[PDB]
């Protein structure tokens, strides 16, 4: 029943600032401390600070004391965090959390859904889709590997399906890689009976809603 | 000259008070202890200050003088304790009030009595607590440690003013 | 600030095994709290105050320890138990989280099926060459791919990515991509990736000749 | 005789130590303060100990001794200060460890810094708290007060052994 | 929803001992402190002590440290308090209460219904009911006062109604008084038109369930 | 241990206006908590941590104060507000409760209707004499009854009991009972109770002669 709600993502130009919100529901907002937590794939979980909306006392981790600023609307039941002077170091997931005194120690008993921040200067870019054509150079044991390469798009995500979703067995879609150009690239592959590559038609359906891209690519055994 | 017997007496009293404050300061108070205690400064300092009371032996000018000249070396070593002790105390008083320049692990039988405690940081993570009595205890203990260290500093300095020929 | 060290980094067990994982603090703490996270969600509270199960946690779990040394234990692992576990402390400022432990499922060794794709004509007409080396359905995760072009070792010009583990057969799939300029792609004849894995008695190379089709 | 100049020097050092420990003990630490502090003893004791250093005067035997006879009264009153000071400390050390024989309201500008604290009872009403750090903070403060008072006791006792001379 | 259930009352011989219980429901019993409180009309509210069922640590007020003993069943979710060497001083209401840490301080957020303890050597005694007959010596302004005296019963309570409950207007039943013989006495009165004391029938119906007494007394002006 | 004093002991107002009550500690406290109790129930929590209303408490109430001095205030009293209020503290060991404040409803002054009942014939056959003096529907509560027998003042031989205040007319009723042995009841002729009250310009005596019927 108790819940915390956050927006899903933010896009920010470098050096600008961003403000993101956590809204409470189902409990007496002014009676508990609200805490903020940062996660990254390189340094795990780090604690930013807290606010007591009952009176506006705050506390900060010194390492972030120059970045963050915590405030609360005592009437609207909304907490805000503001971050200033963003750099590539700040791309991370940020959570709000509620803490309660329970069983002789504090613990974080409820967590928000999390907000993702991307720091990037890059504009929206629609992808180019290139086939990984099946071939004798891709035939094995009565199976062939084939796929689609979704090259150079921004921002995430891309969705891939095959034959409008009629083909699903053996599909592996890999996590996107951020490239040195700042674009992303992704690939998806599937294995099919190599005996019928000459008779069966396979089309991947690529959608990139942020760019409204909707592209169908036929995949057929034209080697090279 | 005749001041010398008196000076020796003063030096001895000043040496005993270091043993007293050094013991009192070693009472369990967390995982971190002041540098001077981990250095054991108060015990050696006091011991050297007492031995340097040798001038209580007075001027035995019998034969070649029986304040044996090695005593001048004896006097000379004790001056080394006054400087270093003063510098140690003025370093510890900084570690309490801006940040850890150093941290030292205390001694194991001390930790057995205060394993969950520190005094070098003292502010709660939970802002609801900023008026809880639990916090007022920690500031009071910091104030006692600053007091003890400042008294040690001044009485140690009171050697260097006089422990020289 | 005190730091919590977790071991092992990757923990491996079959269903019905007993397993244990440990956290050691640099200093003694009042309690340890444990959290579970899976890809794509917020962490969940799991054990609070060293030994009390949170709401709905299955009875398979238990927690124990004191002072500087703590442990969490699972009596009979099950396929849903696969997650990352973080320990946490509140004894001092700031509160800190451990480096995490990742829990896998054991299975038998499976050698990868390897496939290689030359560039498409549409990519060459755009001015780009991408070479993809594919390793399919293998175990263990640990594998190595070296690119060789005309027997010359490539370096610093490739990226690879691996799927999450499949929930039904516990295998992995891996792709590596080599990217060159078109002008460099057509300077050579033989392009190769070399695959080494525990399931292979020797490296297997799949390669093709440019301009041979 | 020639011990007397030394004894005076010792008495002066012993007097300065009371000013030091008396000030340190008065650091804010709760609504109740030790009897000796509320009696204000540490100041008057030390002052009279230094005054009774009047035997610091040289024994000028100029027809009748320049240690004017009123100084003997001075010395005697300082002995009264020594006895009373010892008794007050051995009373306070009991009030910390069994129960309040007396309670004393401290001083208003002291209370301005520790209004919600008492060191004379120290056990939580909530048994979940018996391992909370706040309790270890309180017991550590009690141990510091027992220390300071015991050192005051022994150095005060060190007058009565000799101020009769 | 959280509830603490206690038994209603206890009768104890002097100098014996009594044990009373407080059963919890609706929450994790082992995770909160349980507190006991005493109420009397003389001293008001006094705090007896507490138990933490999570491990069995206890704390007592010194003034009661010789009387009480607190224990908990970690499995059955039941607390117990035992009292020993009872005297007339112990007749009071006893409450259990649940303490939580909330809004920056402790508070007692849930309370039990309370157990009443009576210390008395006396046996069960059925009352004698005497009429306070209406008369000219009880006539005023067109109204007459009449009543029933329920004298000397034990223990409490007595219930009084009039004409099987058909008369309720103007009835005042006074609180029972404990007498120096250790019995209780009570009286109930009602004012009716004085013009009709000779014509109307008024009967009080007295029930004392502990003694199973059920007595009807006609109240009429005809006695003095 | 620290003690909390409350004032006034009894407080009174007319519906619809402001009233205030104080609790003063002998030493400064971090917070005060307020409880409401009515006859025949457990206390209810009412205000926690000096100024936060508990669940369901009507917005008429507010709480304020700091240090040693605190107050609770009611903006517009209503007939349901009648109860006893205790302040409470957790600052030191043990926790303690105040002596309480009782809240009345004012009304106009009403003089008592007085009645007297001689002993019943049935009681005299049982060897007991009870004399009841009744004061009906009066306000304010303060009243005094003196028993006189043949103009001689009785003492130490009477008990009296009063209803609570009736919620529909706000008056009180009191009964006082004099009890004598039968042998002492028949030693005298004139038996009286004397009533004094603010609504009476002089005491009113109701009396009878024994054997007058
Ligand atoms: C000259 C200085 C540097 C060293 C002098 C050492 C001793 C005179 C004193 C100094 C501090 C004292 C310690 C201060 C506190 C304690 C805790 C004490 O334990 C308790 O007080 C609770 C258990 C108990 O003993 O009843 C055990 C002894 C000990 C280590 C004392 C043992 C004797 C010590 C080491
Ligand atoms: C600061 C304190 C705690 C440590 C240092 C004290 C020493 C520096 C003092 C203590 C005793 C002194 C010594 C006592 C005896 C001697 C022997 C003396 O030489 C002889 O007696 C010659 C005949 C012989 O060999 O016995 C020369 C001085 C010396 C070394 C003294 C040198 C200085 C000493 C070692
Ligand atoms: C021979 C006699 C004269 C020596 C007397 C020395 C001590 C008894 C006095 C001198 C200076 C005083 C200290 C001066 C400053 C402080 C800091 C003060 O701490 C704070 O103010 C913390 C909050 C803040 O930063 O303002 C507490 C008292 C204390 C330790 C005092 C304790 C008692 C001291 C050491
Ligand atoms: C012989 C004794 C009776 C007197 C010793 C000299 C006193 C005049 C000194 C000793 C300790 C000092 C007290 C120690 C601590 C404090 C707390 C202090 O407050 C703080 O330290 C924090 C706020 C601040 O002052 O910055 C206010 C002054 C006071 C009472 C000091 C005032 C001056 C005192 C009493
Ligand atoms: C800690 C405090 C209580 C010490 C108090 C010391 C006093 C009791 C001493 C200090 C100075 C002394 C005084 C110093 C000088 C004089 C003047 C002297 O006057 C004379 O006329 C002496 C020569 C003469 O008789 O002609 C009488 C003694 C008296 C009062 C002494 C009496 C005792 C005094 C007051
Ligand atoms: C001139 C030199 C020799 C004087 C040295 C005096 C202090 C340095 C020593 C002497 C006695 C020691 C004290 C003796 C007893 C205690 C009580 C002890 O506290 C407890 O044991 C609490 C638990 C319990 O009651 O068992 C902590 C150390 C302490 C303060 C010791 C602190 C250090 C003291 C004061």
Q: Detail the DSSP E strand segments found in chain A.
A: 3-5, 9-12, 18-25, 33-40, 44-52, 57-60, 68-73, 78-83, 93-102, 105-111, 115-119, 128-132, 139-140, 143-153, 159-162, 172-173, 177-178, 184-193, 202-208, 213-219
Confirm or reject: Cβ of B1 under 6 Å from ligand 2: no
In a shared domain, residues A111 and A167: no
Helices (H), chain D: 3-25, 35-38, 41-51, 70-97, 108-111, 133-160
Measured distance CA(D156)–CA(D17) in Å, rounded? 10
Cis check for the bond before B45: say yes or no (omega within 30 of 0): no
Q: Are E130 and E215 in contact (CB under 8 A)?
A: no
Nearest to residue F61, comparing CAs of F32, F44, F42, F81? F81
Q: Phi and psi for A22 in degrees, rounded to 5? A: -125, 120
Helix (H) or strand (E) holding B44: helix B41-51
Q: What tokens were used for E19?
A: 């044990």
What is the CB neighbour count within 10 angstroms for residue F207? 16
Measured distance CA(D76)–CA(D89) in Å, rounded? 21
Q: Residue C128: its chain A contacts at CB < 8 A? A: 151
> Residue A194 gets which letter from DSSP?
G
What DSSP letter does each residue of B20-35 carry, written as one string? HHHHHHTS--SS---H
Helix (H) or strand (E) holding B47: helix B41-51
Q: Residue A107: its chain E contacts at CB < 8 A? A: none
Per the listing, tokens 């060159």 go with: C180
Query: Which residues have a Cβ under 8 Å from the Cβ of A42 and sit 6 or more positions away?
Result: none
Positive or negative, the CA dihedral E204, E209, E210, E213 is positive
CB-side exposure of E12: number of CA atoms within 13 Å? Answer: 25
Burial class (CB in 10 A: 0-12, 13-18, 19+), E188: buried
Helix (H) or strand (E) holding E218: strand E213-219
> Residue E175 gets which letter from DSSP?
P
Measured distance CA(A184)–CA(A178) in Å, rounded? 4
What DSSP letter does each residue of F17-42 carry, written as one string? S-EEEEEEESS--S--EEEEE-TTS-
Nearest to residue D134, comparing CAs of B23, A104, B33? A104
Contacts 24+ apart (CB under 8 A), C36-44: C36/C83, C36/C84, C36/C85, C37/C83, C37/C84, C37/C85, C37/C86, C38/C82, C38/C83, C38/C84, C39/C164, C42/A95, C42/A111, C42/A112, C42/A113, C42/A114, C43/A45, C43/A111, C43/C86, C44/A111
Q: Residue E104: its chain B contacts at CB < 8 A? A: 128-129, 131-132
Nearest to residue A104, comparing CAs of D127, D124, D128, D126? D128
Burial class (CB in 10 A: 0-12, 13-18, 19+), E216: exposed
Going by alpha carbons, the residue nearest to atom 14 of ligand 4 is D27
Cβ of A33 within 8 Å of Cβ of B126? The answer is yes
What DSSP letter does each residue of chain C carry, written as one string? ---EEEE-SEEEE-TT--EEEEEEESS--S--EEEEE-TTS--EEEEETTTEEPTT--TTEEEEEETTEEEEEESS--GGG-SEEEEEE-SSSSPEE---EEEEE----BPPEEEEEPPPHHHHHHTEEEEEEEEEEEBSS-EEEEEEETTEEP-SSEEEEEPPPPTTT--EEEEEEEEEEHHHHTT-SEEEEEEEETT-SS-EEEEEETT--
Q: Are C96 and C88 in contact (CB under 8 A)?
A: yes
What is the CB neighbour count within 10 angstroms for residue B88? 22
> Residue A154 gets which letter from DSSP?
B
Burial class (CB in 10 A: 0-12, 13-18, 19+), D2: exposed
Residue E224 lies in a domain: no
Q: How far is CA C187 from CA C150, C152, C157, C181, in A?
A: 10, 12, 16, 10
Q: Residue E103: its chain B contacts at CB < 8 A? A: 128
Going by alpha carbons, the residue nearest to atom 22 of ligand 6 is D143
Cβ of A102 within 8 Å of Cβ of C173? The answer is no
Measured distance CA(C45)–CA(C57) in Å, rounded? 9
Helix (H) or strand (E) holding F81: none
- The residue count of chain E comes to 224
Chains F and C physically touch (3 or more Cβ atom pairs below 8 Å): no
Q: Are E193 and E180 in contact (CB under 8 A)?
A: no
Q: Which of B26, B29, B41 to probe ligand 1 with, by most ligand atoms within 8 A of CB?
A: B26
Measured distance CA(A14)–CA(B165) in Å, rounded? 68
Resolution (A): 3.3
Residues of chain F with CATH 2.60.40.10: 4-105, 113-209
Number of structural domains (chain A) is 2
In a shared domain, residues E185 and E109: no
Measured distance CA(D2)–CA(E123) in Å, rounded? 91
Measured distance CA(F47)–CA(F33) in Å, rounded? 6
Ligand 4 geometric centre to CA of F173 (Å): 63
Q: Residue D126: its chain E contacts at CB < 8 A? A: 33, 50, 52, 59, 99, 106
Confirm or reject: Cβ of B79 under 6 Å from ligand 2: no
Beta bridge partners of C6: C23
What is the CB neighbour count within 10 angstroms for residue D53? 21
Q: Does domain F113-209 have CATH number 3.30.360.10?
A: no
SS3 E200: coil
Ligand 3 geometric centre to CA of B147 (Å): 5
Characterize C49-76 residue by residue with b for buried, 16 or more Cβ atoms within 10 angstroms of its Cβ, and e for exposed.
bbebebeebeeebebebeeeebebebee
> Chain-centre distance of CA D115, in angstroms?
24
Last residue of a domain, one of E119, E140, E163: E119
Task: State how far residue E17 is from chain D, nearest Cα, in angstroms.
Answer: 26
Nearest to residue E8, comparing CAs of E20, E19, E23? E20
Last residue of a domain, one of E119, E146, E166: E119
Query: Which residues have a Cβ under 8 Å from the Cβ of A71 and sit 6 or more positions away?
Result: A51, A56, A79, A80, A82
> Chain-centre distance of CA A45, in angstroms?
17
Measured distance CA(E87)–CA(F176) in Å, rounded? 29
In a shared domain, residues A139 and A69: no
Residue A28: domain span: 3-119
Measured distance CA(D70)–CA(B17) in Å, rounded? 32
Ligand 6 geometric centre to CA of D155 (Å): 14
Query: Which residues have a Cβ under 8 Å from the Cβ of C9 and sit 6 or more positions away?
Result: C99, C101, C102
SS3 A210: helix
Chains with at least 3 CB pairs less than 8 angstroms from chain D:
A, B, C, E, F
Residue A206 lies in a domain: yes
Cβ of E44 within 8 Å of Cβ of F86? The answer is yes
Task: State how far residue E36 is from chain A, nearest Cα, in angstroms.
Answer: 19
Nearest to residue B67, comparing CAs of B53, B55, B83, B49? B55
What DSSP letter does each residue of F139-161 carry, written as one string? BSS-EEEEEEETTEEP-S-EEEE
How many E/F residue pairs have CB atoms within 8 Å?
Answer: 114
Beta bridge partners of A149: A130, A187
Contacts 24+ apart (CB under 8 A), C58-64: C63/C32, C63/C34
SS3 D89: helix
Q: What tokens were used for F157?
A: 């031989």
E175: domain CATH number? 2.60.40.10
Q: What tokens were used for B91?
A: 């370093």
In a shared domain, residues E193 and E175: yes
What is the CB neighbour count within 10 angstroms for residue A25? 11
In a shared domain, residues E114 and E135: no
Residues with CB under 6 A from ligand 3: B 143, 146-147, 150-151, 154; D 16, 19-20, 23-24, 27
- The residue count of chain A comes to 224
Measured distance CA(E112)–CA(D34) in Å, rounded? 42
Maximum C-alpha span of chain E: 73
Residue A224 lies in a domain: no
Positive or negative, the CA dihedral D105, D108, D110, D113 is positive
Cβ of F128 within 8 Å of Cβ of E103? The answer is no
Mutate to test the interface with B, among D13, D42, D148 (most CBs of B within 10 A): D13
SS3 B133: helix
Q: Are D24 and D36 in contact (CB under 8 A)?
A: no
SS3 E110: strand
Measured distance CA(D164)–CA(E2) in Å, rounded? 73
Q: Are A33 and A87 in contact (CB under 8 A)?
A: no
Q: What was the experiment behind these coordinates?
A: cryo-EM
Instruction: Report the relative pairing of strands E202-208 and E159-162 from DSSP bridges.
Output: antiparallel
Q: What tokens were used for B126?
A: 């939970």
Nearest to residue C97, comparing CAs of B104, B33, A61? A61
Nearest to residue B94, comparing CAs of B39, B34, B151? B34
Query: Which residues have a Cβ under 8 Å from the Cβ of B96 and sit 6 or more positions away?
Result: B34, B119, B120, B142, B145, B146, B149
Measured distance CA(D145)–CA(D149) in Å, rounded? 6
Chains with at least 3 CB pairs less than 8 angstroms from chain A:
B, C, D, E
Going by alpha carbons, the residue nearest to atom 23 of ligand 5 is D68
Nearest to residue F68, comparing CAs of F22, F35, F100? F22
Going by alpha carbons, the residue nearest to atom 10 of ligand 1 is B23
How many C/D residue pairs have CB atoms within 8 Å?
Answer: 3
A47 at interface of C, judged by CB pairs closer than 8 A: yes
Q: Which atom of ligand 5 is nearest to the CA of D70?
A: 33
State which residue of chain D sits closest to B19, comparing Cα positions: D151
Ligand 4 geometric centre to CA of D27 (Å): 6
- The residue count of chain B comes to 165
Ligand 2 geometric centre to CA of B156 (Å): 26
In a shared domain, residues A9 and A96: yes
In a shared domain, residues E114 and E141: no
- The residue count of chain C comes to 213
Give me the residue from A31, A103, A104 closest to E103, CB to CB: A31
> Residue B140 gets which letter from DSSP?
H
State which residue of chain D sits closest to F93, comparing Cα positions: D125
Measured distance CA(C159)–CA(A183) in Å, rounded? 14
Helix (H) or strand (E) holding F11: strand F10-11
In a shared domain, residues E82 and E104: yes
Helices (H) and strands (E) in chain F, counts: 2, 19
Task: State how far residue D121 is from chain A, nearest Cα, in angstroms.
Answer: 21
Q: Which atom of ligand 1 is nearest to the CA of B27?
A: 14
Measured distance CA(F211)–CA(F213) in Å, rounded? 6
Tell me the CATH class for F4-105. Answer: mainly beta
């Amino acid at each position: 029943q108790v819940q915390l709600q956050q927006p899903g993502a933010e896009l920010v130009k470098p050096g600008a600032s961003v403000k993101m919100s956590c809204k409470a529901s189902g409990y007496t907002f002014t009676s508990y401390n609200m805490h903020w937590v940062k996660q990254t794939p390189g340094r795990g979980l780090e604690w930013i600070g807290a606010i007591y909306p009952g009176n506006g006392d705050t506390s900060y981790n010194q390492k972030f004391k120059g970045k963050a600023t915590l405030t609360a609307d005592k009437s609207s039941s909304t907490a805000y965090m503001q971050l200033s002077s963003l750099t590539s170091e700040d791309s991370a997931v940020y959570y709000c959390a509620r803490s309660t005194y329970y069983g002789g120690d504090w613990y974080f008993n409820v967590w928000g859904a999390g907000t993702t921040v991307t720091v990037s200067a890059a504009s929206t870019k629609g992808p180019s889709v290139f086939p990984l054509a099946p071939s004798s150079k891709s035939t094995s044991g009565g199976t062939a590997a084939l796929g689609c390469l979704v090259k150079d798009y921004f921002p995430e995500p891309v969705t891939v399906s095959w034959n409008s979703g009629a083909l699903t067995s053996g599909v592996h879609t890999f996590p996107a890689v951020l490239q040195s150009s700042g674009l992303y690239s992704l690939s998806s592959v599937v294995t099919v009976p190599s005996s019928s590559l000459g008779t069966q038609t396979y089309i991947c359906n690529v959608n990139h809603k942020p760019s409204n891209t909707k592209v169908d690519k036929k995949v057929e055994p034209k080697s090279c | 000259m005749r001041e010398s017997k008196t000076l020796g007496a003063v030096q001895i009293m000043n040496g005993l008070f270091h043993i007293a404050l050094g013991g009192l300061l070693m009472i369990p108070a967390g995982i971190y202890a002041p540098i001077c205690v981990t250095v054991w400064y108060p015990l050696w300092g006091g011991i050297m200050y007492i031995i340097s009371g040798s001038l209580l032996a007075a001027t035995e000018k019998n034969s070649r003088k029986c304040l044996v000249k090695g005593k001048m070396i004896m006097n000379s070593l004790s001056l080394f304790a006054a400087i270093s002790g003063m510098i140690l105390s003025i370093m510890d008083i900084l570690n309490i009030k801006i940040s850890h320049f150093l941290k030292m692990e205390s001694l194991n039988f001390i930790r057995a009595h205060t394993p969950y405690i520190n005094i070098y940081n003292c502010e709660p993570a939970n802002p609801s607590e900023k008026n809880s009595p639990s916090t007022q205890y920690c500031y009071s203990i910091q104030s006692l440690f600053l007091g003890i260290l400042s008294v040690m500093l001044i009485f140690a300095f009171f050697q260097e003013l006089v422990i020289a020929g | 600030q005190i730091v919590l060290s977790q071991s092992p980094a990757i923990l491996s067990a079959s269903p019905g095994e007993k397993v244990t994982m440990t956290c050691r603090a640099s200093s003694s703490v009042s309690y340890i709290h444990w959290f579970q996270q899976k890809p794509g969600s917020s962490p969940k509270p799991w054990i609070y105050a060293t030994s009390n199960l949170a709401s709905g946690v299955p009875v398979r779990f238990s927690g124990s320890g004191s002072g500087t040394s703590y442990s969490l234990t699972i009596s009979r692992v099950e396929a849903e138990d696969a997650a990352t576990y973080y320990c946490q402390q509140w004894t001092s400022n700031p509160p800190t989280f451990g480096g995490g432990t990742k829990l896998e499922i054991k299975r038998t060794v499976a050698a990868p099926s390897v496939f290689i794709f030359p560039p498409s004509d549409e990519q060459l007409k755009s001015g780009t060459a991408s070479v993809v080396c594919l390793l399919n359905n293998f175990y263990p995760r640990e594998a190595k791919v070296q690119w060789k072009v005309d027997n010359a070792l490539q370096s610093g010009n490739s990226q690879e990515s691996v799927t999450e583990q499949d929930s039904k057969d516990s295998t992995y799939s891996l792709s590596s991509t080599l990217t060159l300029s078109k002008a460099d792609y057509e300077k050579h004849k033989v392009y190769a990736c070399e695959v080494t894995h525990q399931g292979l008695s020797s490296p297997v190379t799949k390669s093709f000749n440019r301009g041979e089709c």
